Amino acid sequence: IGINKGGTHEHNKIRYIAGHDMKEANRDSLQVHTSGVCAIRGTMGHFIVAYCP
Amino acid sequence: IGINKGGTHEHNKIRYIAGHDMKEANRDSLQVHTSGVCAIRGTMGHFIVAYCP
C-alpha cells in the first residue's frame, strides 16, 4: 500500500499491476472480511493488520 | 433524528454533533446490524425500532 510512483505517506491510494504494467486504485474501497463483517485498523506496506471476528 | 434546527418529518436529514456545534449528515448511511444485517422499520427522535436476526 501507499506508493504514488515513489515514496509517499498517505492512506488514500493503493497500487496493483494488471499484466506487466503498473496501475492505480483507491484504498478506501479495500476490504478484508471473514464470514462476518470485518474492519481494518491501520496498515502499511505489504501487510494488512487488523482485528476480526 | 429528523431535526434541521426545527421540527420536520422527513427521511434524508440526520444530525451528528461533534464538539459544541451542529453538523449535517445523510440518513441513507444509517445502518444497524449484528453479525447478520438487521432491518430498519422507521423511527422518530432519540429512539430506533427494528427487526433483526
XYZ file of all heavy atoms in Angstrom:
810
model
N 0.833 -1.192 0.000
C 0.000 0.000 0.000
C 0.873 1.249 0.000
O 2.042 1.234 0.395
C -0.971 0.028 1.201
C -0.234 0.432 2.474
C -1.582 -1.343 1.417
C -1.165 0.819 3.590
N 0.278 2.356 -0.446
C 0.841 3.685 -0.300
C 2.101 4.005 -1.079
O 3.141 4.292 -0.478
N 2.027 3.963 -2.411
C 3.095 4.434 -3.291
C 2.464 5.168 -4.467
O 1.493 4.683 -5.058
C 3.996 3.286 -3.791
C 4.683 2.575 -2.625
C 5.045 3.808 -4.759
C 3.984 1.334 -2.157
N 3.027 6.324 -4.814
C 2.497 7.171 -5.878
C 3.543 7.357 -6.969
O 3.817 8.489 -7.383
C 2.059 8.526 -5.318
C 1.012 8.394 -4.231
O 0.905 9.246 -3.350
N 0.223 7.331 -4.297
N 4.132 6.246 -7.418
C 5.332 6.138 -8.247
C 6.598 6.367 -7.433
O 7.697 6.356 -8.003
C 5.339 7.098 -9.449
C 4.425 6.713 -10.607
C 2.966 7.019 -10.309
C 2.081 6.721 -11.509
N 0.633 6.822 -11.178
N 6.484 6.559 -6.126
C 7.641 6.744 -5.278
C 7.227 6.803 -3.824
O 6.047 6.670 -3.489
N 8.217 7.009 -2.959
C 7.969 7.066 -1.531
C 6.997 8.158 -1.130
O 7.202 9.333 -1.455
N 5.934 7.783 -0.421
C 4.908 8.729 -0.009
C 4.178 8.176 1.206
O 4.050 6.958 1.360
C 3.920 9.016 -1.149
O 3.019 10.061 -0.757
C 3.128 7.767 -1.509
N 3.724 9.077 2.075
C 2.995 8.723 3.289
C 1.560 9.215 3.143
O 1.302 10.423 3.215
C 3.671 9.330 4.517
C 3.015 8.975 5.815
N 3.326 9.607 7.000
C 2.075 8.049 6.119
C 2.601 9.091 7.976
N 1.834 8.144 7.468
N 0.630 8.285 2.940
C -0.775 8.623 2.760
C -1.614 7.370 2.974
O -1.089 6.263 3.109
C -1.027 9.235 1.377
C -0.441 8.431 0.226
C -1.341 7.297 -0.223
O -2.559 7.356 0.040
O -0.821 6.341 -0.836
N -2.938 7.563 3.001
C -3.861 6.458 3.221
C -5.074 6.536 2.300
O -6.184 6.167 2.702
C -4.326 6.406 4.679
C -4.937 7.685 5.168
N -4.222 8.856 5.287
C -6.199 7.972 5.565
C -5.016 9.811 5.737
N -6.222 9.301 5.914
N -4.897 7.027 1.075
C -5.982 7.045 0.097
C -5.473 6.638 -1.281
O -5.840 7.238 -2.296
C -6.660 8.416 0.041
C -5.667 9.560 -0.019
O -4.459 9.347 -0.103
N -6.176 10.785 0.028
N -4.627 5.610 -1.337
C -4.075 5.161 -2.615
C -3.525 3.752 -2.460
O -2.798 3.471 -1.501
C -2.986 6.111 -3.108
C -2.634 5.946 -4.577
C -3.842 6.173 -5.462
C -4.310 7.615 -5.400
N -5.572 7.812 -6.160
N -3.881 2.874 -3.395
C -3.383 1.506 -3.462
C -2.850 1.239 -4.863
O -3.410 1.722 -5.855
C -4.473 0.482 -3.071
C -3.874 -0.921 -2.929
C -5.624 0.498 -4.057
C -2.910 -1.050 -1.810
N -1.752 0.492 -4.940
C -1.141 0.109 -6.207
C -1.392 -1.362 -6.500
O -1.384 -2.200 -5.593
C 0.369 0.333 -6.210
C 1.070 -0.345 -5.049
C 2.568 -0.113 -5.055
N 3.162 -0.404 -6.358
C 3.492 0.505 -7.266
N 3.251 1.791 -7.077
N 4.077 0.111 -8.393
N -1.608 -1.668 -7.776
C -1.542 -3.036 -8.258
C -1.002 -3.013 -9.681
O -0.813 -1.949 -10.282
C -2.904 -3.737 -8.174
C -3.967 -3.213 -9.113
C -4.072 -3.686 -10.416
C -4.872 -2.250 -8.693
C -5.048 -3.213 -11.274
C -5.851 -1.769 -9.543
C -5.935 -2.252 -10.832
O -6.909 -1.775 -11.681
N -0.744 -4.199 -10.218
C -0.270 -4.361 -11.585
C -1.161 -5.389 -12.264
O -1.254 -6.533 -11.806
C 1.206 -4.796 -11.648
C 2.123 -3.728 -11.040
C 1.611 -5.122 -13.077
C 2.353 -3.868 -9.561
N -1.830 -4.978 -13.335
C -2.546 -5.890 -14.216
C -1.699 -6.091 -15.462
O -1.327 -5.117 -16.125
C -3.930 -5.347 -14.578
N -1.397 -7.346 -15.779
C -0.397 -7.609 -16.793
C 0.996 -7.311 -16.265
O 1.316 -7.571 -15.104
N 1.843 -6.774 -17.142
C 3.178 -6.328 -16.762
C 3.292 -4.804 -16.762
O 4.373 -4.257 -16.993
C 4.232 -6.948 -17.677
C 4.117 -6.523 -19.109
N 3.220 -7.094 -19.984
C 4.791 -5.586 -19.817
C 3.344 -6.525 -21.170
N 4.291 -5.608 -21.096
N 2.184 -4.109 -16.502
C 2.169 -2.655 -16.428
C 1.460 -2.215 -15.154
O 0.381 -2.717 -14.825
C 1.489 -2.041 -17.662
C 0.031 -2.433 -17.783
O -0.826 -1.732 -17.204
O -0.257 -3.446 -18.453
N 2.075 -1.274 -14.443
C 1.584 -0.835 -13.145
C 0.373 0.083 -13.304
O 0.236 0.799 -14.302
C 2.725 -0.160 -12.374
C 2.371 0.581 -11.091
S 1.647 2.212 -11.336
C 3.054 3.261 -10.979
N -0.507 0.058 -12.305
C -1.787 0.758 -12.366
C -2.049 1.438 -11.021
O -1.191 1.457 -10.132
C -2.912 -0.215 -12.741
C -2.939 -0.603 -14.209
C -3.665 0.442 -15.038
C -5.167 0.357 -14.832
N -5.905 1.263 -15.756
N -3.252 1.994 -10.875
C -3.676 2.693 -9.668
C -5.067 2.240 -9.247
O -5.829 1.670 -10.033
C -3.689 4.220 -9.857
C -2.438 4.820 -10.462
C -1.233 4.648 -9.562
O -1.333 4.985 -8.365
O -0.183 4.192 -10.051
N -5.385 2.514 -7.984
C -6.712 2.295 -7.423
C -6.787 3.042 -6.097
O -5.812 3.653 -5.654
C -7.018 0.805 -7.249
N -7.956 2.984 -5.465
C -8.213 3.726 -4.236
C -8.219 2.782 -3.038
O -8.792 1.690 -3.105
C -9.542 4.478 -4.321
C -9.479 5.846 -3.668
O -8.405 6.432 -3.532
N -10.632 6.360 -3.259
N -7.575 3.211 -1.949
C -7.517 2.390 -0.743
C -8.875 2.281 -0.056
O -9.195 1.231 0.512
C -6.474 2.950 0.227
C -6.741 2.622 1.690
C -5.603 3.059 2.593
N -5.874 2.738 3.989
C -5.350 1.706 4.636
N -4.523 0.864 4.039
N -5.668 1.512 5.914
N -9.689 3.341 -0.106
C -10.946 3.353 0.638
C -11.893 2.240 0.212
O -12.803 1.891 0.973
C -11.640 4.708 0.479
C -11.376 5.636 1.650
O -10.858 5.161 2.681
O -11.693 6.839 1.539
N -11.704 1.672 -0.977
C -12.507 0.545 -1.427
C -11.938 -0.802 -0.997
O -12.573 -1.831 -1.252
C -12.651 0.577 -2.951
O -11.384 0.515 -3.584
N -10.770 -0.821 -0.360
C -10.180 -2.075 0.089
C -10.948 -2.626 1.283
O -11.280 -1.895 2.222
C -8.708 -1.870 0.449
C -7.882 -3.070 0.918
C -6.474 -2.979 0.358
C -7.836 -3.146 2.436
N -11.228 -3.927 1.247
C -11.989 -4.569 2.310
C -11.513 -6.001 2.492
O -11.400 -6.751 1.517
C -13.491 -4.545 2.002
C -14.219 -3.336 2.563
C -15.607 -3.169 1.979
O -15.967 -3.829 1.004
N -16.398 -2.283 2.576
N -11.234 -6.371 3.739
C -10.935 -7.745 4.119
C -11.965 -8.177 5.152
O -12.206 -7.463 6.133
C -9.496 -7.892 4.657
C -9.240 -6.937 5.811
C -9.244 -9.322 5.106
N -12.598 -9.325 4.919
C -13.649 -9.777 5.820
C -13.778 -11.291 5.776
O -13.741 -11.896 4.699
C -14.991 -9.119 5.475
C -15.544 -9.525 4.144
N -16.285 -10.672 3.965
C -15.467 -8.933 2.929
C -16.639 -10.771 2.696
N -16.156 -9.728 2.046
N -13.923 -11.890 6.956
C -14.265 -13.299 7.100
C -15.767 -13.480 6.930
O -16.442 -12.597 6.391
C -13.807 -13.835 8.458
O -14.159 -15.221 8.569
C -14.460 -13.057 9.589
N -16.288 -14.639 7.341
C -17.717 -14.941 7.298
C -18.576 -13.763 7.749
O -19.636 -13.506 7.168
C -18.022 -16.166 8.161
O -17.688 -15.930 9.518
N -18.133 -13.043 8.782
C -18.817 -11.855 9.239
C -18.143 -10.576 8.752
O -17.032 -10.581 8.229
N -18.852 -9.463 8.941
C -18.335 -8.164 8.523
C -17.136 -7.799 9.389
O -17.189 -7.889 10.622
C -19.436 -7.096 8.606
C -18.866 -5.715 8.316
C -20.568 -7.427 7.643
N -16.051 -7.379 8.744
C -14.779 -7.142 9.407
C -14.313 -5.711 9.161
O -14.837 -5.004 8.296
C -13.723 -8.143 8.922
S -12.282 -8.321 9.982
N -13.316 -5.287 9.940
C -12.826 -3.915 9.916
C -11.303 -3.896 9.898
O -10.647 -4.848 10.331
C -13.337 -3.116 11.122
N -10.748 -2.799 9.385
C -9.304 -2.608 9.267
C -8.890 -1.456 10.172
O -9.467 -0.364 10.103
C -8.884 -2.332 7.810
C -9.210 -3.525 6.906
C -7.401 -2.000 7.735
C -10.602 -3.494 6.298
N -7.885 -1.698 11.016
C -7.393 -0.661 11.920
C -6.485 0.329 11.197
O -6.798 1.521 11.097
C -6.648 -1.305 13.093
C -5.927 -0.320 14.002
C -6.848 0.779 14.508
N -6.358 1.354 15.755
C -6.997 2.278 16.459
N -8.168 2.758 16.069
N -6.453 2.728 17.585
N -5.355 -0.150 10.686
C -4.384 0.698 10.025
C -3.192 -0.110 9.561
O -2.636 -0.901 10.328
N -2.782 0.083 8.310
C -1.820 -0.795 7.667
C -0.733 0.029 6.992
O -0.871 1.239 6.790
C -2.506 -1.703 6.637
O -3.102 -0.896 5.614
C -3.601 -2.518 7.305
N 0.358 -0.647 6.640
C 1.447 -0.014 5.912
C 2.248 -1.098 5.206
O 2.498 -2.164 5.776
C 2.342 0.811 6.848
C 3.460 1.587 6.152
S 4.947 0.635 5.784
C 5.643 0.446 7.421
N 2.648 -0.816 3.968
C 3.431 -1.756 3.190
C 2.635 -2.973 2.746
O 1.424 -2.916 2.511
N 3.341 -4.101 2.634
C 2.771 -5.331 2.093
C 1.732 -5.965 3.005
O 1.023 -6.875 2.562
C 3.884 -6.349 1.826
C 4.632 -6.115 0.550
N 5.524 -5.079 0.388
C 4.628 -6.795 -0.620
C 6.031 -5.124 -0.831
N 5.504 -6.156 -1.463
N 1.619 -5.517 4.250
C 0.894 -6.245 5.278
C -0.379 -5.514 5.679
O -0.415 -4.281 5.736
C 1.785 -6.460 6.503
C 3.163 -6.946 6.161
C 4.281 -6.325 6.685
C 3.339 -8.019 5.303
C 5.549 -6.768 6.367
C 4.605 -8.466 4.982
C 5.712 -7.840 5.514
N -1.421 -6.293 5.957
C -2.702 -5.794 6.442
C -2.926 -6.398 7.821
O -3.015 -7.623 7.958
C -3.855 -6.158 5.493
C -3.609 -5.586 4.094
C -5.180 -5.661 6.051
C -3.513 -4.080 4.047
N -3.013 -5.548 8.839
C -3.118 -5.990 10.225
C -4.421 -5.457 10.805
O -4.728 -4.268 10.663
C -1.902 -5.539 11.057
C -1.708 -4.031 10.968
C -2.045 -5.981 12.499
N -5.196 -6.340 11.434
C -6.495 -5.925 11.949
C -7.024 -6.943 12.948
O -6.524 -8.066 13.051
C -7.510 -5.729 10.816
N -8.028 -6.511 13.708
C -8.890 -7.427 14.439
C -9.922 -8.007 13.482
O -10.198 -7.435 12.424
C -9.618 -6.721 15.585
C -8.737 -6.021 16.592
C -8.045 -4.866 16.256
C -8.611 -6.506 17.887
C -7.244 -4.224 17.172
C -7.812 -5.867 18.814
C -7.132 -4.725 18.451
O -6.333 -4.083 19.369
N -10.502 -9.149 13.861
C -11.560 -9.672 13.011
C -12.355 -10.696 13.801
O -11.755 -11.469 14.560
C -10.981 -10.310 11.742
S -12.141 -10.313 10.371
N -13.679 -10.732 13.665
C -14.477 -11.729 14.388
C -14.184 -13.132 13.887
O -13.691 -13.307 12.763
C -15.923 -11.310 14.082
C -15.828 -10.579 12.789
C -14.525 -9.837 12.855
N -33.064 12.105 15.504
C -33.186 12.054 14.057
C -34.220 13.084 13.623
O -35.014 13.588 14.423
C -33.584 10.657 13.549
C -34.975 10.297 14.047
C -32.634 9.604 14.086
C -35.519 9.075 13.392
N -34.202 13.397 12.330
C -35.237 14.219 11.734
C -35.378 15.601 12.334
O -36.498 16.070 12.562
N -34.257 16.262 12.611
C -34.249 17.618 13.141
C -33.285 18.449 12.306
O -32.136 18.045 12.089
C -33.858 17.651 14.630
C -34.871 16.866 15.468
C -33.782 19.085 15.127
C -36.183 17.594 15.686
N -33.752 19.604 11.844
C -32.991 20.521 10.999
C -33.027 21.920 11.594
O -33.353 22.900 10.920
C -33.523 20.537 9.570
C -35.035 20.648 9.509
O -35.687 20.968 10.504
N -35.600 20.397 8.334
N -32.713 22.010 12.889
C -32.927 23.201 13.714
C -34.411 23.483 13.917
O -34.797 24.616 14.223
C -32.223 24.439 13.138
C -30.762 24.225 12.771
C -29.920 23.872 13.984
C -28.451 23.760 13.609
N -27.868 25.083 13.254
N -35.243 22.462 13.750
C -36.673 22.602 13.948
C -37.364 21.287 13.660
O -36.758 20.337 13.155
N -38.650 21.246 13.995
C -39.425 20.037 13.775
C -39.670 19.790 12.296
O -40.024 20.696 11.539
N -39.485 18.535 11.885
C -39.701 18.146 10.499
C -39.852 16.633 10.416
O -39.170 15.894 11.132
C -38.551 18.616 9.594
O -38.798 18.198 8.245
C -37.219 18.048 10.065
N -40.760 16.187 9.553
C -40.959 14.772 9.264
C -40.402 14.496 7.873
O -40.917 15.020 6.880
C -42.440 14.399 9.349
C -42.715 12.947 9.109
N -42.924 12.427 7.850
C -42.819 11.906 9.969
C -43.143 11.127 7.944
N -43.085 10.786 9.219
N -39.361 13.678 7.805
C -38.570 13.522 6.587
C -37.741 12.246 6.715
O -37.849 11.511 7.703
C -37.709 14.764 6.350
C -36.754 15.068 7.494
C -35.450 14.311 7.394
O -35.110 13.855 6.284
O -34.776 14.155 8.433
N -36.907 11.980 5.701
C -36.114 10.758 5.677
C -34.698 10.953 5.140
O -34.041 9.958 4.811
C -36.825 9.681 4.841
C -36.861 9.984 3.373
N -37.207 11.222 2.876
C -36.590 9.210 2.297
C -37.147 11.197 1.557
N -36.776 9.988 1.180
N -34.203 12.190 5.025
C -32.886 12.402 4.432
C -32.077 13.467 5.167
O -31.213 14.116 4.565
C -33.008 12.761 2.946
C -33.739 14.076 2.709
O -34.065 14.808 3.644
N -33.998 14.378 1.442
N -32.330 13.660 6.460
C -31.611 14.669 7.242
C -31.335 14.109 8.634
O -32.247 13.988 9.458
C -32.393 15.973 7.317
C -32.242 16.857 6.090
C -33.242 18.002 6.114
C -34.661 17.495 5.917
N -35.671 18.585 5.958
N -30.073 13.773 8.888
C -29.608 13.325 10.193
C -28.541 14.292 10.683
O -27.714 14.771 9.898
C -29.077 11.873 10.153
C -28.885 11.339 11.572
C -27.786 11.762 9.358
C -30.154 11.189 12.342
N -28.585 14.610 11.975
C -27.612 15.496 12.601
C -26.669 14.665 13.463
O -27.116 13.835 14.263
C -28.289 16.595 13.425
C -29.074 16.118 14.637
C -29.413 17.271 15.567
N -29.974 18.426 14.877
C -30.369 19.535 15.489
N -30.281 19.669 16.802
N -30.860 20.536 14.764
N -25.370 14.864 13.269
C -24.359 14.359 14.182
C -23.601 15.537 14.781
O -23.262 16.500 14.089
C -23.402 13.396 13.472
C -22.200 14.051 12.830
C -20.968 14.071 13.470
C -22.293 14.630 11.571
C -19.868 14.663 12.883
C -21.199 15.225 10.977
C -19.989 15.237 11.636
O -18.897 15.829 11.043
N -23.352 15.463 16.084
C -22.817 16.583 16.847
C -21.392 16.248 17.256
O -21.164 15.346 18.072
C -23.683 16.915 18.071
C -25.067 17.406 17.635
C -22.994 17.950 18.946
C -26.089 16.309 17.428
N -20.433 16.971 16.686
C -19.035 16.901 17.080
C -18.656 18.214 17.748
O -18.895 19.290 17.190
C -18.131 16.634 15.875
N -18.069 18.124 18.937
C -17.795 19.338 19.676
C -19.077 20.003 20.138
O -20.110 19.358 20.347
N -19.011 21.327 20.299
C -20.151 22.121 20.746
C -20.896 22.781 19.591
O -21.494 23.849 19.776
C -19.691 23.174 21.753
C -18.368 23.790 21.421
N -17.170 23.255 21.842
C -18.054 24.896 20.705
C -16.176 24.004 21.401
N -16.685 25.006 20.709
N -20.878 22.177 18.408
C -21.522 22.722 17.222
C -22.506 21.703 16.654
O -22.626 20.577 17.143
C -20.479 23.118 16.172
C -19.647 24.311 16.599
O -20.161 25.156 17.360
O -18.477 24.403 16.172
N -23.218 22.113 15.608
C -24.161 21.257 14.903
C -23.651 20.993 13.493
O -23.054 21.873 12.866
C -25.552 21.897 14.850
C -25.931 22.665 16.108
S -25.832 21.662 17.604
C -26.326 22.856 18.844
N -23.891 19.780 12.997
C -23.363 19.357 11.707
C -24.445 18.633 10.917
O -25.432 18.145 11.474
C -22.134 18.450 11.868
C -20.982 19.060 12.665
C -20.382 20.299 12.003
C -20.168 20.125 10.501
N -19.463 18.856 10.168
N -24.243 18.569 9.604
C -25.178 17.944 8.680
C -24.663 16.587 8.210
O -23.461 16.388 8.018
C -25.424 18.853 7.471
C -26.454 18.323 6.485
C -27.878 18.595 6.923
O -28.113 19.621 7.595
O -28.765 17.780 6.594
N -25.595 15.654 8.019
C -25.280 14.321 7.525
C -26.538 13.724 6.906
O -27.639 14.262 7.048
C -24.722 13.426 8.638
N -26.365 12.604 6.207
C -27.442 11.964 5.461
C -27.900 10.698 6.175
O -27.074 9.904 6.635
C -27.000 11.631 4.034
C -28.149 11.154 3.159
O -29.289 11.039 3.611
N -27.851 10.877 1.896
N -29.222 10.523 6.267
C -29.800 9.336 6.888
C -29.537 8.063 6.089
O -29.571 6.970 6.663
C -31.309 9.526 7.070
C -32.006 8.392 7.812
C -33.492 8.355 7.504
N -34.171 7.267 8.198
C -35.034 7.434 9.190
N -35.347 8.639 9.639
N -35.598 6.365 9.745
N -29.268 8.180 4.784
C -29.114 6.994 3.946
C -27.991 6.089 4.438
O -28.030 4.874 4.212
C -28.866 7.409 2.494
C -29.365 6.381 1.496
O -29.377 5.177 1.826
O -29.747 6.779 0.374
N -26.993 6.652 5.114
C -25.883 5.863 5.629
C -26.182 5.210 6.973
O -25.337 4.462 7.477
C -24.632 6.734 5.754
O -23.594 6.033 6.415
N -27.347 5.468 7.563
C -27.672 4.894 8.863
C -27.981 3.409 8.712
O -28.983 3.033 8.096
C -28.856 5.631 9.484
C -29.313 5.170 10.870
C -28.214 5.389 11.896
C -30.584 5.896 11.282
N -27.120 2.567 9.281
C -27.282 1.121 9.228
C -26.979 0.533 10.596
O -25.943 0.837 11.192
C -26.361 0.487 8.176
C -26.399 1.140 6.802
C -26.005 0.183 5.693
O -26.855 -0.466 5.084
N -24.706 0.090 5.428
N -27.886 -0.307 11.083
C -27.688 -1.088 12.298
C -27.630 -2.555 11.899
O -28.415 -3.008 11.059
C -28.802 -0.821 13.334
C -30.168 -1.229 12.793
C -28.511 -1.549 14.635
N -26.667 -3.287 12.460
C -26.544 -4.699 12.118
C -25.717 -5.434 13.162
O -24.664 -4.946 13.587
C -25.923 -4.878 10.725
C -24.529 -4.346 10.604
N -23.416 -5.097 10.918
C -24.067 -3.144 10.189
C -22.329 -4.377 10.707
N -22.696 -3.188 10.265
N -26.209 -6.603 13.573
C -25.434 -7.574 14.336
C -24.565 -8.377 13.375
O -24.306 -7.920 12.256
C -26.350 -8.497 15.150
O -25.552 -9.378 15.953
C -27.248 -9.323 14.241
N -24.060 -9.530 13.825
C -23.377 -10.465 12.934
C -24.077 -10.562 11.581
O -23.441 -10.449 10.528
C -23.293 -11.843 13.596
O -24.571 -12.281 14.022
N -25.396 -10.772 11.596
C -26.192 -10.606 10.400
C -26.756 -9.199 10.280
O -26.845 -8.456 11.253
N -27.143 -8.828 9.059
C -27.670 -7.488 8.832
C -29.076 -7.384 9.412
O -29.900 -8.298 9.273
C -27.639 -7.141 7.332
C -28.558 -8.058 6.533
C -28.008 -5.681 7.114
N -29.347 -6.275 10.100
C -30.655 -6.033 10.686
C -31.578 -5.414 9.635
O -31.201 -5.213 8.477
C -30.542 -5.125 11.910
S -29.634 -5.778 13.351
N -32.808 -5.100 10.041
C -33.793 -4.474 9.165
C -34.430 -3.297 9.891
O -35.073 -3.482 10.928
C -34.859 -5.481 8.730
N -34.263 -2.098 9.336
C -34.799 -0.882 9.940
C -36.233 -0.663 9.480
O -36.546 -0.771 8.289
C -33.903 0.325 9.603
C -34.461 1.600 10.239
C -33.716 0.470 8.094
C -34.595 1.521 11.742
N -37.115 -0.349 10.432
C -38.541 -0.214 10.151
C -38.948 1.231 9.884
O -39.760 1.492 8.990
C -39.357 -0.774 11.320
C -40.867 -0.807 11.098
C -41.211 -1.364 9.722
N -42.640 -1.598 9.536
C -43.334 -2.565 10.124
N -42.767 -3.412 10.966
N -44.631 -2.684 9.857
N -38.385 2.175 10.634
C -38.817 3.559 10.606
C -38.937 4.090 12.018
O -39.626 3.495 12.852
N -38.264 5.201 12.308
C -38.052 5.642 13.681
C -38.349 7.134 13.799
O -38.668 7.809 12.815
C -36.620 5.325 14.131
O -35.689 6.024 13.299
C -36.347 3.843 13.997
N -38.244 7.651 15.025
C -38.512 9.061 15.285
C -37.769 9.457 16.552
O -37.873 8.772 17.573
C -40.022 9.318 15.430
C -40.471 10.792 15.427
S -39.733 11.942 16.610
C -40.247 11.226 18.168
N -37.032 10.567 16.485
C -36.362 11.114 17.648
C -35.184 10.279 18.126
O -34.416 9.717 17.341
N -35.042 10.208 19.452
C -33.913 9.535 20.082
C -33.940 8.022 19.904
O -32.939 7.365 20.210
C -33.874 9.858 21.580
C -33.108 11.099 21.920
N -32.678 11.378 23.200
C -32.699 12.136 21.153
C -32.032 12.531 23.205
N -32.031 13.012 21.974
N -35.040 7.457 19.419
C -35.289 6.025 19.509
C -35.140 5.360 18.148
O -35.397 5.978 17.110
C -36.691 5.757 20.058
C -36.943 6.382 21.397
C -38.199 6.857 21.723
C -35.921 6.519 22.322
C -38.435 7.443 22.944
C -36.155 7.105 23.550
C -37.412 7.567 23.860
N -34.713 4.098 18.162
C -34.690 3.258 16.973
C -35.538 2.023 17.252
O -35.577 1.526 18.378
C -33.246 2.870 16.573
C -32.406 4.124 16.308
C -33.241 1.963 15.346
C -32.930 4.987 15.176
N -36.242 1.543 16.232
C -37.038 0.322 16.337
C -36.763 -0.527 15.106
O -36.685 -0.006 13.987
C -38.546 0.628 16.487
C -39.093 1.306 15.235
C -39.310 -0.649 16.784
N -36.574 -1.830 15.308
C -36.146 -2.635 14.175
C -36.389 -4.118 14.422
O -36.455 -4.579 15.566
C -34.663 -2.385 13.870
N -36.537 -4.848 13.321
C -36.307 -6.282 13.321
C -34.825 -6.566 13.121
O -34.073 -5.730 12.611
C -37.092 -6.978 12.207
C -38.557 -7.238 12.484
C -39.477 -7.279 11.452
C -39.000 -7.529 13.755
C -40.818 -7.540 11.689
C -40.337 -7.779 14.004
C -41.225 -7.792 12.967
O -42.561 -8.045 13.231
N -34.414 -7.776 13.495
C -33.042 -8.197 13.252
C -32.880 -9.685 13.534
O -33.478 -10.207 14.484
C -32.070 -7.387 14.110
S -30.344 -7.648 13.694
N -32.093 -10.394 12.732
C -31.781 -11.790 13.035
C -30.973 -11.897 14.314
O -30.261 -10.953 14.689
C -30.964 -12.240 11.814
C -30.431 -10.977 11.225
C -31.505 -9.962 11.454
